[PDB]
């Protein structure tokens, strides 16, 4: 009965769709113009023509990782406490793991992050006197353009709690009140707070379907005691990676912006 | 996975085992002989022997290749290739110093070394290039032992193959059957090894031996040094030798003056 | 009066059929038969070519650091390209001539190996020529070639040029006039080097099958170990479909024939194919 | 003086009689031998072949059109034509010279079957004259010729254009003097090629049979695969009829002899058969 | 002192005699048993020969009058000639050596098979004298001769046009010294053609027997198929007679030897036959 | 740092030996094989050969003086002289290394051999050294030298001169080089008299066997019929004795090892043997 | 010290004595085998030879006058000659020598024998030297000789001149220099005709015999059939007879060996044998 200690809340890794994958690379096919042209037609007349635009696109496999110095020793006294490490390590990377996913630079080392694919908010949407929340509201609307329903929303921590907060020129707040609050909901949508996610800055879209997670090799923890000198020093070397590629079906499907002040 | 030619050096010399650190063996010196017709009751000649114990090290060829981590789980069969690929570039510096080994410290007696000297005066005017490979399997004689062997870089061998009369006609082979490597009943041996405008020939059948210590192998570490914090993979290749020289003077090196 | 002709009774003659078409010059095929043959199914093909081997092993003394070698890599890629063409006949015609469609079957992908072989010896690369072995081929070293040499002189220069990637040549291309042009060489005596007027010589050089072809245009030479050198890719095997619901076939009483055939090169080791031009 | 000149006693010896005719030298008939021969029972033959084969078959781009191809063919006719001569003769002759009657025949029969040589070799084509070899027979390519070459090398460069249309060539035909001349060539030293003073060489070249005919005009020779590349078709076999009452002849107490025969010439692939001229 | 000189005991010593007289060498008579021979009885010869052969065989159109073809014939004839030669001798020598008239006969009858063997060759035609080989013999054509031939070529030259006549040469007749020179040939390195001087060099020539005769003049030569050619026919065989009534001979006590001999020489194929001069 | 060398573990590692001894370069010995070997037991040895035989022998008159011939003899002496030498070692060494004992032996009888064959060959004649065959030897004729003559020519010239003895040749005895240099004769094309590169030929020239030996000084060249020329005689066979007692041997613990050989050569017939030079 | 020193005990020690004696070369005999023998009774020898044989014979015309032909005859003298020498010796030697004197007559017979050969070859024919067959052999013909001939050109010619006596040559006689010289000839390439250096040239030229003596002098040269052109007639055995009362020799104790042999040379045909000189 070992017991975990980190978070409980929804990792981005969780609003994609996960797979598995042996190649170094992935090519694959994002589709682009849909001109669509159907219409009705009476008999012996000819028909319409749709056309539909596609760009092949190549998602590289980046690799992720961490390694800890520890006395050889103190393992082997305490059991327990590396099973600890390494099940903390795993946290420790999964973190780093979501600050890519996200802001990926898109360079020779970082991934082709969403608010790198995303589509810029319309701001043309914002009405007068209207909230921060009435922005996301507009978002979601946002993403129905793309022909996806939005599933998803990450905020920086300090924002999202500032946001659940909001009270009007009562003093009644604009979410449900402590009594009758649940958790990280909006919209009816799931809400992932990230210190990844920069304070002011947004996305919204429908991950779920848009964009998928392809994992070339599960997180996982190996030892060495021969790693260089580790040996003649009586240490454990604790590794800790995970290599995996991100793809993108669908950029329109996804949204990112600003909070004015 | 690349084929290799009709066999070489090795071949041509003498090939034993063994599991030690060198070799001892014990050759004859100086025979100061001095046998010769003695008047009566007079004084006899006194002749006399040298001996010598030469050894013989056991050195060591090897080298290796560090590969990321990764992109030998993207491509498994590389493994297999590479590993078949780095017994082939060994085996073929081990000829390089076969041949050419300074003798030097770490470098092998190579042959061309320990080889006596080609005579330039047995040169003679207007000679092919076959006729001074012809010259050095005569003085190979000057030590009472039968030639065993050429060895040629194997563009000189190319242009030697195809040399003809002052009538037009092939010496070797008439422009149809595959001219065999081949010289005066003596095997032929084409090596990059030797480099151009020199070659060596010799009673190798019987001259100078080759013991080996330790086989070809191919280890591969995940620990070593750095190695498993930088995600790489040291594949290594070595193989332990000893290059015996009996006879120095059933061996020739040259250069043709040409 | 009364011929053999229009104006008597010529007309009441029948002339003899010769039972049997007759099928024209059919040059041998070649060249294909010289690779390796594998089926599959992508549309490209991903492979890699040792691009250079710094292999630097020397000796190392005991406690010693080793010597690192490395080796350079470079990724290519062979596309699929597809050939073929098509006749549009008679509906009549086939019904008329029983074995005639089974015929222009026979006639058609004889046609399409042809521009087949064309194509893997002279190919291109730009547009949708694969990449031929000539293309590929590295150059010819004219540094070897010396005084007074025949044109035999320099096929057994090339063949050493082979070696040089390490690999056994495996046949010679020539064009055929060159190729008898070689056959027929005397010495500065006058007597012939081959076969003399006794008899033709067999097709075989310095030990290795010539293959003389039309393809290779004459001037030109190509030398190598073609059975390891490069592989052929056959994703869609040589086939022929035939149909009348084709454009406006149905209402015009026509058949519409085709034979297409999709291949890929790939080329392996360049350094193991050698071509080069015959100085006239 | 009692001689034996005339005006003496010649006249009381008879000159001795020396039993038999001297026919002058029988020339070894050839060609219909060589080709292949088959009996017909119609007045001409009608055989097809394939003429024009435009082949644009090629490497198609995506989503493009295809190269079209379109063949054609053509029937080709080989009429039968007569040959035939007839000599009137003196019936008191007849009666007179037994022997005579069954000589003459022999002489007609080898007197046509050697006017069949001659058009199957020089056939004008020219309405009835038959279309013999030469003129159907493919033009020697001159570009073929190369720099010095003895009248050995231009067979050689014959039999080679055969090659260049997929057919192996049968034999060789030339007139003798021509062949005579070649079979003496020597090299610079002195030496003969073919056969050594001791004996003379073998009727072969480039292995194959040499066919040398005073049929064959100077400075001319013909190469292919004649064996099959053309047929001989018998219509009627050579025949000898007589007749006295033939018009006139019974009043004038005469007799003519009558002899003829029925061919046709059928040329299946002239693009296997070569003529040329020697460069004298 | 008593020696064996003529003014000494010498004249008690008498010579050894050796039995036998030394008779010279005899020429190899060739020419006769190389034709065909048989006799007669009459006084000359008549065979026929087909003159003029008017071959106008050819190709008739239907309905059209055939060509006419006529025939001549000629009657050739050959003369009976007489050889002979007398010997006048004393009878006092002919009763004092008995065996001398049993030498002079095989003296005498081979004596005359010599000029025999004379004439058959170079028979002069005129008047008496035999119509020889040579006479009759065709020409030699000079057209034949290239530039650069050996004497060897000549002859190979020469036996190609026997040939033209239709029929094989069985024979070569030449000067012992010139044939002698020919085999003596050597090509432009030195080397014998014949025979390295080791061997022999066996008396065939091109397939042919050669014929060494010391009839033949120098610088002049023969070929053909002279067993078919020509037939020698024997009136009357040599024959050796004695009388002592001859003449005057009775009161000069003497006697005279004769012997004579009856030829007729039939040229057949006079076509068949070539004379030449080496032109050098 | 444990390293292989003296300073760390060197030592316990153990040199692995090879047995036996690596004996230098054996010149095959022949000569002493070349001549007669008979067995004697004296000092010397005497013969006799005629010397002058002044023949006068010629046709005689009748009753006069006839020609007187004469006759001279000598007797020629053959020394028997002694070749030997010793080699005194530690008697430790020998007792301690047993196979030295017995090798040292192989090593005198052959290195003595080897003086031997040296003294047969080149015997200065004077004082104890033997009269070697090159100095008993007749000299070459310079006379028969012509112009262009190769090495090989001499050669075959000197055999002609051995005949003038009416003796045939046994063998030929070359300088391993100067033998050589002639196996690599060319003619003028530039092809090899015995050679032909892809084998190397045999010791043998004109029937006689050739022994090259390195005894035989360079330029200098011999030929003769040495099985019947000269003959070698043995008073004592080689042999090899120790002796523990030699002088101070004992009380130095010594070991005098001694190997002797007593010879006679005797030279019949020096008209049949001869040397020369070459052009230097 | 006790050496074998003369002046010390070596006159204590007796050479080992080789019994018999070195006989000197002897020289192989041929001439006398080539010949013809058979002994007589008489002095000289008579044989008569056709000399002038008139051959007229010819063609006579009827009733015409027939020719004469005539012979003529000459008696040939062969005298025979006498050859001898004698050796006068010590009587004290011939006892104190047992097999001497034996060994003399086997020394003497073939003394005699030598100048026997040296006669029949050389013989001056003057005096008593017998007529030998250099002066009777016919003078080699000059105009033989062509440009560009080797001295093996001449002997064929020689043997093609013996030819026209109508004989089949028997063998050649060269002086072995001569002879030898020749197998050594060279092509224009620097081959050799007879036997490349490796082989042995056999005494066989031009499928004849050859026969090299040192009777025949440097530059002169014998052919023709001498088995049956002249025959040696042996009148007295060589023999061998001795006497003491020979002269003085009875009171100065001394002994006269001699030996002598009567021959005849008899020379039937000359024109048969050639004799001439070598221009160099």
């Known amino acids: 009965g070992i017991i975990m200690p980190g978070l409980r809340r929804l990792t981005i890794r969780d609003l994609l769709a996960q797979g598995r994958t042996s190649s170094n690379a992935l090519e694959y096919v994002r589709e682009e113009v849909f001109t669509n042209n159907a219409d009705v037609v009476a008999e012996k007349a000819l028909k319409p023509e749709s056309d539909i635009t596609f760009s092949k696109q190549t998602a590289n496999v980046k690799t992720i990782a961490h390694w800890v110095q520890a006395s050889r020793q103190v393992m082997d006294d305490a059991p327990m406490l590396q099973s600890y490490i390494n099940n903390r390590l795993m946290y420790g990377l999964a973190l780093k793991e979501e600050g890519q996913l996200l802001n990926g630079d898109g360079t020779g080392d970082n991934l082709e992050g969403l608010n790198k694919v995303a589509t810029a ?5 914002n009405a007068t006197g209207d909230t921060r929340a009435d922005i996301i509201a507009h978002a979601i609307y946002q993403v129905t353009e793309s022909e996806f329903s939005a599933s998803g929303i990450v905020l920086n921590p300090r924002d999202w709690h500032n946001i659940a907060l909001l009270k009007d020129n009562e003093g009644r707040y604009i979410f449900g009140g402590p009594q009758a609050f649940t958790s990280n909901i909006m919209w009816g949508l799931p809400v992932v707070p990230t210190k990844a996610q920069a304070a002011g800055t947004f996305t919204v879209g429908g991950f779920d379907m848009a964009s998928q997670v392809w994992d070339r090799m599960d997180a996982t923890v190996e030892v060495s005691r ?6 003649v020093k009586n240490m454990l070397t604790i ?5 995996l590629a991100l793809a993108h079906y669908r950029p329109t499907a996804i949204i990112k912006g600003t909070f004015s002040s």
């Open 121 to 125: 908010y319309d701001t043309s949407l």
């Open 226 to 231: 021969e790693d260089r000198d580790n040996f």
């Open 239 to 243: 590794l800790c990676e995970e290599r």
